[PDB]
mmCIF file of C-alpha atoms and ligand atoms in Angstrom:
data_model
loop_
_atom_site.group_PDB
_atom_site.id
_atom_site.type_symbol
_atom_site.label_atom_id
_atom_site.label_comp_id
_atom_site.label_asym_id
_atom_site.label_seq_id
_atom_site.Cartn_x
_atom_site.Cartn_y
_atom_site.Cartn_z
ATOM 1 C CA UNK U 1 26.380 -32.836 -26.524
ATOM 2 C CA UNK U 2 26.320 -30.473 -29.536
ATOM 3 C CA UNK U 3 25.386 -26.881 -30.078
ATOM 4 C CA UNK U 4 22.348 -27.840 -32.126
ATOM 5 C CA UNK U 5 21.233 -30.300 -29.413
ATOM 6 C CA UNK U 6 21.824 -27.463 -26.916
ATOM 7 C CA UNK U 7 19.562 -25.253 -29.067
ATOM 8 C CA UNK U 8 16.518 -27.367 -28.499
ATOM 9 C CA UNK U 9 17.226 -28.007 -24.861
ATOM 10 C CA UNK U 10 16.307 -24.330 -24.482
ATOM 11 C CA UNK U 11 13.207 -25.010 -26.580
ATOM 12 C CA UNK U 12 12.390 -28.196 -24.709
ATOM 13 C CA UNK U 13 12.715 -26.502 -21.221
ATOM 14 C CA UNK U 14 10.989 -23.241 -22.277
ATOM 15 C CA UNK U 15 8.102 -25.351 -23.539
ATOM 16 C CA UNK U 16 7.941 -27.663 -20.552
ATOM 17 C CA UNK U 17 7.762 -24.614 -18.236
ATOM 18 C CA UNK U 18 5.146 -22.716 -20.189
ATOM 19 C CA UNK U 19 2.988 -25.810 -20.465
ATOM 20 C CA UNK U 20 3.309 -26.429 -16.647
ATOM 21 C CA UNK U 21 2.463 -23.038 -15.147
ATOM 22 C CA UNK U 22 -0.504 -22.873 -12.796
ATOM 23 C CA UNK U 23 0.231 -19.100 -12.555
ATOM 24 C CA UNK U 24 -0.193 -17.587 -15.990
ATOM 25 C CA UNK U 25 1.915 -14.425 -16.100
ATOM 26 C CA UNK U 26 -0.393 -11.980 -17.825
ATOM 27 C CA UNK U 27 -3.170 -13.018 -15.455
ATOM 28 C CA UNK U 28 -1.029 -11.880 -12.506
ATOM 29 C CA UNK U 29 -0.023 -8.474 -13.861
ATOM 30 C CA UNK U 30 -3.671 -7.822 -14.684
ATOM 31 C CA UNK U 31 -4.450 -8.315 -10.968
ATOM 32 C CA UNK U 32 -1.851 -6.250 -9.049
ATOM 33 C CA UNK U 33 -4.470 -3.452 -8.879
ATOM 34 C CA UNK U 34 -6.809 -5.900 -7.072
ATOM 35 C CA UNK U 35 -5.130 -5.354 -3.770
ATOM 36 C CA UNK U 36 -6.510 -6.862 -0.522
ATOM 37 C CA UNK U 37 -8.363 -4.568 1.822
ATOM 38 C CA UNK U 38 -7.649 -3.705 5.519
ATOM 39 C CA UNK U 39 -10.964 -5.261 6.404
ATOM 40 C CA UNK U 40 -10.035 -8.437 4.494
ATOM 41 C CA UNK U 41 -6.429 -8.384 5.679
ATOM 42 C CA UNK U 42 -7.580 -8.337 9.364
ATOM 43 C CA UNK U 43 -9.900 -11.204 8.540
ATOM 44 C CA UNK U 44 -6.841 -13.272 7.549
ATOM 45 C CA UNK U 45 -4.986 -11.985 10.600
ATOM 46 C CA UNK U 46 -7.765 -13.033 12.981
ATOM 47 C CA UNK U 47 -7.839 -16.576 11.571
ATOM 48 C CA UNK U 48 -6.517 -19.348 13.911
ATOM 49 C CA UNK U 49 -2.911 -20.275 13.446
ATOM 50 C CA UNK U 50 -3.527 -23.815 12.286
ATOM 51 C CA UNK U 51 -6.028 -22.600 9.672
ATOM 52 C CA UNK U 52 -3.669 -20.257 8.042
ATOM 53 C CA UNK U 53 -1.203 -23.217 8.107
ATOM 54 C CA UNK U 54 -3.650 -25.740 6.677
ATOM 55 C CA UNK U 55 -4.636 -23.225 3.976
ATOM 56 C CA UNK U 56 -1.051 -22.386 2.989
ATOM 57 C CA UNK U 57 0.207 -25.990 3.000
ATOM 58 C CA UNK U 58 -2.768 -26.880 0.745
ATOM 59 C CA UNK U 59 -1.738 -24.004 -1.525
ATOM 60 C CA UNK U 60 1.937 -25.071 -1.487
ATOM 61 C CA UNK U 61 0.908 -28.581 -2.380
ATOM 62 C CA UNK U 62 -1.129 -27.328 -5.364
ATOM 63 C CA UNK U 63 1.959 -25.469 -6.544
ATOM 64 C CA UNK U 64 4.168 -28.551 -6.180
ATOM 65 C CA UNK U 65 1.837 -30.646 -8.359
ATOM 66 C CA UNK U 66 2.746 -28.363 -11.247
ATOM 67 C CA UNK U 67 6.500 -28.614 -10.431
ATOM 68 C CA UNK U 68 6.321 -32.425 -10.423
ATOM 69 C CA UNK U 69 4.785 -32.136 -13.905
ATOM 70 C CA UNK U 70 7.506 -29.660 -14.979
ATOM 71 C CA UNK U 71 10.027 -32.227 -13.807
ATOM 72 C CA UNK U 72 8.056 -34.981 -15.469
ATOM 73 C CA UNK U 73 8.419 -33.101 -18.790
ATOM 74 C CA UNK U 74 12.079 -32.225 -18.330
ATOM 75 C CA UNK U 75 13.635 -34.279 -21.145
ATOM 76 C CA UNK U 76 16.277 -36.483 -19.526
ATOM 77 C CA UNK U 77 14.684 -36.416 -16.080
ATOM 78 C CA UNK U 78 12.344 -39.408 -16.466
ATOM 79 C CA UNK U 79 15.218 -41.394 -17.918
ATOM 80 C CA UNK U 80 16.532 -41.524 -14.337
ATOM 81 C CA UNK U 81 15.970 -44.087 -11.581
ATOM 82 C CA UNK U 82 12.969 -43.553 -9.333
ATOM 83 C CA UNK U 83 15.167 -43.090 -6.304
ATOM 84 C CA UNK U 84 16.910 -40.156 -8.141
ATOM 85 C CA UNK U 85 13.815 -38.545 -9.555
ATOM 86 C CA UNK U 86 12.176 -38.549 -6.123
ATOM 87 C CA UNK U 87 15.326 -37.213 -4.372
ATOM 88 C CA UNK U 88 15.678 -34.361 -6.914
ATOM 89 C CA UNK U 89 12.025 -33.440 -6.348
ATOM 90 C CA UNK U 90 12.071 -33.992 -2.594
ATOM 91 C CA UNK U 91 14.796 -31.308 -2.163
ATOM 92 C CA UNK U 92 14.288 -28.987 -5.188
ATOM 93 C CA UNK U 93 10.527 -28.820 -5.585
ATOM 94 C CA UNK U 94 10.031 -26.177 -2.815
ATOM 95 C CA UNK U 95 13.099 -24.370 -4.303
ATOM 96 C CA UNK U 96 11.349 -24.207 -7.665
ATOM 97 C CA UNK U 97 8.082 -23.049 -5.967
ATOM 98 C CA UNK U 98 10.035 -20.274 -4.275
ATOM 99 C CA UNK U 99 11.620 -19.066 -7.569
ATOM 100 C CA UNK U 100 8.307 -19.187 -9.422
ATOM 101 C CA UNK U 101 6.853 -16.960 -6.643
ATOM 102 C CA UNK U 102 8.812 -14.053 -8.093
ATOM 103 C CA UNK U 103 6.124 -13.710 -10.782
ATOM 104 C CA UNK U 104 3.278 -13.557 -8.215
ATOM 105 C CA UNK U 105 5.336 -10.825 -6.484
ATOM 106 C CA UNK U 106 4.891 -7.082 -7.141
ATOM 107 C CA UNK U 107 7.989 -5.171 -5.997
ATOM 108 C CA UNK U 108 6.338 -1.712 -6.272
ATOM 109 C CA UNK U 109 3.970 -2.192 -3.345
ATOM 110 C CA UNK U 110 5.898 -5.247 -1.949
ATOM 111 C CA UNK U 111 2.768 -7.392 -2.357
ATOM 112 C CA UNK U 112 2.334 -11.012 -3.424
ATOM 113 C CA UNK U 113 -0.672 -12.642 -5.149
ATOM 114 C CA UNK U 114 -2.647 -14.757 -2.674
ATOM 115 C CA UNK U 115 -6.175 -16.284 -2.978
ATOM 116 C CA UNK U 116 -7.308 -14.047 -5.799
ATOM 117 C CA UNK U 117 -5.936 -10.742 -4.650
ATOM 118 C CA UNK U 118 -2.574 -9.012 -3.901
ATOM 119 C CA UNK U 119 -1.597 -8.763 -0.191
ATOM 120 C CA UNK U 120 1.450 -7.868 1.774
ATOM 121 C CA UNK U 121 3.526 -9.886 4.185
ATOM 122 C CA UNK U 122 1.292 -8.621 6.977
ATOM 123 C CA UNK U 123 -1.391 -10.959 5.511
ATOM 124 C CA UNK U 124 0.393 -13.964 6.892
ATOM 125 C CA UNK U 125 0.871 -12.734 10.497
ATOM 126 C CA UNK U 126 -1.321 -15.462 11.931
ATOM 127 C CA UNK U 127 1.198 -18.109 10.680
ATOM 128 C CA UNK U 128 3.508 -17.072 13.530
ATOM 129 C CA UNK U 129 6.654 -17.300 11.343
ATOM 130 C CA UNK U 130 7.039 -13.570 10.405
ATOM 131 C CA UNK U 131 10.814 -13.950 10.163
ATOM 132 C CA UNK U 132 10.570 -16.626 7.432
ATOM 133 C CA UNK U 133 7.701 -14.886 5.651
ATOM 134 C CA UNK U 134 9.747 -11.719 5.353
ATOM 135 C CA UNK U 135 12.685 -13.616 3.863
ATOM 136 C CA UNK U 136 10.501 -15.075 1.093
ATOM 137 C CA UNK U 137 9.366 -11.516 0.161
ATOM 138 C CA UNK U 138 12.985 -10.283 0.457
ATOM 139 C CA UNK U 139 13.980 -13.236 -1.836
ATOM 140 C CA UNK U 140 11.201 -12.614 -4.425
ATOM 141 C CA UNK U 141 12.135 -8.910 -4.158
ATOM 142 C CA UNK U 142 15.691 -9.897 -5.020
ATOM 143 C CA UNK U 143 14.721 -11.865 -8.133
ATOM 144 C CA UNK U 144 12.320 -9.019 -9.131
ATOM 145 C CA UNK U 145 15.475 -6.813 -9.504
ATOM 146 C CA UNK U 146 16.810 -9.463 -11.934
ATOM 147 C CA UNK U 147 13.932 -8.790 -14.341
ATOM 148 C CA UNK U 148 13.575 -12.410 -15.415
ATOM 149 C CA UNK U 149 12.125 -13.481 -18.660
ATOM 150 C CA UNK U 150 9.818 -16.495 -18.568
ATOM 151 C CA UNK U 151 12.438 -18.279 -20.730
ATOM 152 C CA UNK U 152 15.089 -17.328 -18.151
ATOM 153 C CA UNK U 153 12.834 -18.553 -15.292
ATOM 154 C CA UNK U 154 12.344 -21.835 -17.273
ATOM 155 C CA UNK U 155 16.058 -22.595 -17.543
ATOM 156 C CA UNK U 156 16.881 -21.399 -14.060
ATOM 157 C CA UNK U 157 14.206 -23.570 -12.384
ATOM 158 C CA UNK U 158 15.412 -26.691 -14.159
ATOM 159 C CA UNK U 159 18.874 -26.042 -12.819
ATOM 160 C CA UNK U 160 17.350 -25.598 -9.421
ATOM 161 C CA UNK U 161 15.685 -28.986 -9.925
ATOM 162 C CA UNK U 162 18.522 -30.793 -11.683
ATOM 163 C CA UNK U 163 21.254 -30.646 -8.968
ATOM 164 C CA UNK U 164 24.083 -33.159 -9.333
ATOM 165 C CA UNK U 165 25.274 -32.788 -5.680
ATOM 166 C CA UNK U 166 22.053 -33.586 -3.875
ATOM 167 C CA UNK U 167 22.608 -35.910 -0.939
ATOM 168 C CA UNK U 168 21.121 -39.366 -1.730
ATOM 169 C CA UNK U 169 21.483 -39.674 -5.499
ATOM 170 C CA UNK U 170 22.033 -43.268 -6.590
ATOM 171 C CA UNK U 171 23.688 -42.503 -9.969
ATOM 172 C CA UNK U 172 25.471 -39.144 -9.612
ATOM 173 C CA UNK U 173 27.056 -38.669 -13.051
ATOM 174 C CA UNK U 174 23.764 -39.171 -15.010
ATOM 175 C CA UNK U 175 22.603 -35.929 -13.332
ATOM 176 C CA UNK U 176 25.968 -34.160 -13.653
ATOM 177 C CA UNK U 177 25.777 -34.650 -17.433
ATOM 178 C CA UNK U 178 22.041 -33.708 -17.499
ATOM 179 C CA UNK U 179 22.943 -30.722 -15.258
ATOM 180 C CA UNK U 180 26.010 -29.813 -17.427
ATOM 181 C CA UNK U 181 23.873 -29.979 -20.652
ATOM 182 C CA UNK U 182 21.096 -27.952 -18.897
ATOM 183 C CA UNK U 183 23.886 -25.521 -17.705
ATOM 184 C CA UNK U 184 24.984 -24.826 -21.313
ATOM 185 C CA UNK U 185 21.450 -24.131 -22.452
ATOM 186 C CA UNK U 186 21.142 -21.464 -19.770
ATOM 187 C CA UNK U 187 24.411 -19.797 -20.522
ATOM 188 C CA UNK U 188 23.844 -20.038 -24.261
ATOM 189 C CA UNK U 189 20.360 -18.465 -24.114
ATOM 190 C CA UNK U 190 21.738 -15.732 -21.812
ATOM 191 C CA UNK U 191 24.509 -15.192 -24.349
ATOM 192 C CA UNK U 192 22.130 -15.030 -27.344
ATOM 193 C CA UNK U 193 19.792 -12.654 -25.496
ATOM 194 C CA UNK U 194 22.639 -10.433 -24.378
ATOM 195 C CA UNK U 195 22.096 -11.308 -20.670
ATOM 196 C CA UNK U 196 25.373 -13.042 -19.538
ATOM 197 C CA UNK U 197 25.745 -10.253 -16.899
ATOM 198 C CA UNK U 198 22.915 -11.589 -14.674
ATOM 199 C CA UNK U 199 24.769 -14.764 -13.842
ATOM 200 C CA UNK U 200 26.499 -12.917 -10.958
ATOM 201 C CA UNK U 201 23.300 -11.196 -9.693
ATOM 202 C CA UNK U 202 21.625 -14.608 -9.145
ATOM 203 C CA UNK U 203 21.048 -15.521 -5.446
ATOM 204 C CA UNK U 204 23.887 -17.532 -3.871
ATOM 205 C CA UNK U 205 23.100 -21.191 -4.070
ATOM 206 C CA UNK U 206 22.704 -21.664 -0.291
ATOM 207 C CA UNK U 207 19.910 -19.030 -0.203
ATOM 208 C CA UNK U 208 17.151 -21.463 -1.324
ATOM 209 C CA UNK U 209 18.347 -24.235 0.985
ATOM 210 C CA UNK U 210 18.151 -21.732 3.841
ATOM 211 C CA UNK U 211 14.586 -20.722 2.956
ATOM 212 C CA UNK U 212 13.396 -24.370 2.679
ATOM 213 C CA UNK U 213 15.352 -25.220 5.816
ATOM 214 C CA UNK U 214 13.506 -22.439 7.700
ATOM 215 C CA UNK U 215 10.129 -23.810 6.486
ATOM 216 C CA UNK U 216 10.945 -27.321 7.702
ATOM 217 C CA UNK U 217 12.178 -25.780 10.968
ATOM 218 C CA UNK U 218 8.945 -23.799 11.307
ATOM 219 C CA UNK U 219 6.642 -26.726 10.487
ATOM 220 C CA UNK U 220 8.530 -28.647 13.181
ATOM 221 C CA UNK U 221 7.404 -26.009 15.694
ATOM 222 C CA UNK U 222 3.801 -25.887 14.524
ATOM 223 C CA UNK U 223 3.568 -29.719 14.419
ATOM 224 C CA UNK U 224 4.352 -29.700 18.158
ATOM 225 C CA UNK U 225 1.605 -27.063 18.863
ATOM 226 C CA UNK U 226 -0.849 -28.747 16.482
ATOM 227 C CA UNK U 227 0.060 -32.405 15.886
ATOM 228 C CA UNK U 228 -3.370 -33.748 14.847
ATOM 229 C CA UNK U 229 -3.918 -30.866 12.467
ATOM 230 C CA UNK U 230 -0.942 -32.209 10.413
ATOM 231 C CA UNK U 231 -2.093 -35.819 10.597
ATOM 232 C CA UNK U 232 -5.754 -34.982 9.806
ATOM 233 C CA UNK U 233 -5.818 -31.801 7.688
ATOM 234 C CA UNK U 234 -2.400 -31.401 6.082
ATOM 235 C CA UNK U 235 -1.978 -32.700 2.501
ATOM 236 C CA UNK U 236 -0.022 -35.953 2.256
ATOM 237 C CA UNK U 237 2.494 -34.644 -0.382
ATOM 238 C CA UNK U 238 3.236 -31.824 2.071
ATOM 239 C CA UNK U 239 3.853 -34.281 4.943
ATOM 240 C CA UNK U 240 5.970 -36.475 2.580
ATOM 241 C CA UNK U 241 8.283 -33.611 1.464
ATOM 242 C CA UNK U 242 8.510 -31.637 4.731
ATOM 243 C CA UNK U 243 7.359 -33.254 7.982
ATOM 244 C CA UNK U 244 8.731 -36.266 9.867
ATOM 245 C CA UNK U 245 7.448 -38.742 9.889
ATOM 246 C CA UNK U 246 5.406 -38.090 6.726
ATOM 247 C CA UNK U 247 6.814 -40.283 3.947
ATOM 248 C CA UNK U 248 4.790 -43.207 5.380
ATOM 249 C CA UNK U 249 2.425 -42.540 2.399
ATOM 250 C CA UNK U 250 4.554 -41.989 -0.720
ATOM 251 C CA UNK U 251 2.444 -39.869 -3.036
ATOM 252 C CA UNK U 252 5.484 -38.806 -5.037
ATOM 253 C CA UNK U 253 6.206 -42.018 -6.958
ATOM 254 C CA UNK U 254 2.491 -42.345 -7.681
ATOM 255 C CA UNK U 255 2.838 -39.228 -9.870
ATOM 256 C CA UNK U 256 6.047 -40.545 -11.408
ATOM 257 C CA UNK U 257 4.345 -43.804 -12.663
ATOM 258 C CA UNK U 258 1.135 -42.651 -14.410
ATOM 259 C CA UNK U 259 1.568 -40.978 -17.773
HETATM 260 O O1 L7J V 1 -0.373 -19.940 0.003
HETATM 261 S S1 L7J V 1 0.470 -19.418 -1.295
HETATM 262 O O2 L7J V 1 -0.599 -18.966 -2.486
HETATM 263 C C1 L7J V 1 1.563 -18.059 -0.899
HETATM 264 C C2 L7J V 1 1.744 -17.006 -1.780
HETATM 265 C C3 L7J V 1 2.556 -15.978 -1.452
HETATM 266 C C4 L7J V 1 3.278 -15.942 -0.278
HETATM 267 C C5 L7J V 1 3.078 -16.979 0.599
HETATM 268 C C6 L7J V 1 3.892 -16.977 1.926
HETATM 269 F F1 L7J V 1 3.313 -17.836 2.818
HETATM 270 F F2 L7J V 1 5.179 -17.276 1.749
HETATM 271 F F3 L7J V 1 3.802 -15.708 2.449
HETATM 272 C C7 L7J V 1 2.276 -18.063 0.311
HETATM 273 N N1 L7J V 1 1.493 -20.665 -1.839
HETATM 274 C C8 L7J V 1 2.130 -20.699 -3.208
HETATM 275 C C9 L7J V 1 3.552 -20.587 -3.040
HETATM 276 C C10 L7J V 1 3.841 -21.016 -1.582
HETATM 277 C C11 L7J V 1 5.039 -21.335 -0.922
HETATM 278 C C12 L7J V 1 4.948 -21.687 0.422
HETATM 279 C C13 L7J V 1 3.710 -21.735 1.106
HETATM 280 O O3 L7J V 1 3.553 -22.153 2.432
HETATM 281 C C14 L7J V 1 4.781 -22.411 3.090
HETATM 282 C C15 L7J V 1 4.571 -21.938 4.528
HETATM 283 C C16 L7J V 1 5.264 -20.849 5.026
HETATM 284 CL CL1 L7J V 1 6.458 -20.006 3.988
HETATM 285 C C17 L7J V 1 5.040 -20.495 6.364
HETATM 286 N N2 L7J V 1 4.157 -21.075 7.118
HETATM 287 C C18 L7J V 1 3.457 -22.162 6.661
HETATM 288 C C19 L7J V 1 3.608 -22.587 5.330
HETATM 289 CL CL2 L7J V 1 2.715 -23.977 4.775
HETATM 290 C C20 L7J V 1 2.522 -21.405 0.394
HETATM 291 C C21 L7J V 1 2.603 -21.027 -0.973
#
């Protein structure tokens, strides 16, 4: 488009992200001294596997409801066909949740905010996927060395969400031009803010696909151990995005109709 239209894309996205944060930043920094206790950490460790899963899936789902709203406010996004809004969310909504987690992450004690207090990766030992849990801390630890601004996180998460080369898009170019316009707003704000140099420190694209692909691969395993915990206790939007078969009940386009 134009440089003046590019100037309010930054504004539009920075507003849509600030108005769609469950996690309010200043509330998280004012709680990193509220660190979990060995007696509470062991309490989480001694919880059954499926209960730490059911509790985290429910917490992931709550974090995706705010992403689907972020997407719903991304000007240009709801001008797209339902099949393309859902496919952008179905693949990029966990990726947005993972990049937003860098704010709930404290790199000094390598702790993450969880259920009202800050805990380490040892907190999630009962889940049985220690290798994947570690890579999410190592990933949030990597973005914490980028020292993101909330405006930077806004424009980076839209580009995580608005991906023109997702498999399954009906109309590809309508996203390419929404991606390319979003891509200028990010480079222009980084230019203005004297931050063009972080474009090379950003994680390689295939780093988020690998983290989401591990989560799907580790839900597969837990589904086999606890099948009826997924059908009975797991949230439907979780099963729709991640497990198969789970899109039998399409909660996604329910949220993309009401407004
Ligand atoms: O519960 S969070 O407040 C949470 C907060 C910090 C760290 C974690 C975890 F887990 F990364 F250390 C979890 N929340 C909000 C953001 C988020 C992302 C994924 C998630 O769960 C996915 C999952 C995994 Cl990665 C492994 N096994 C079962 C599941 Cl369902 C939960 C979640």
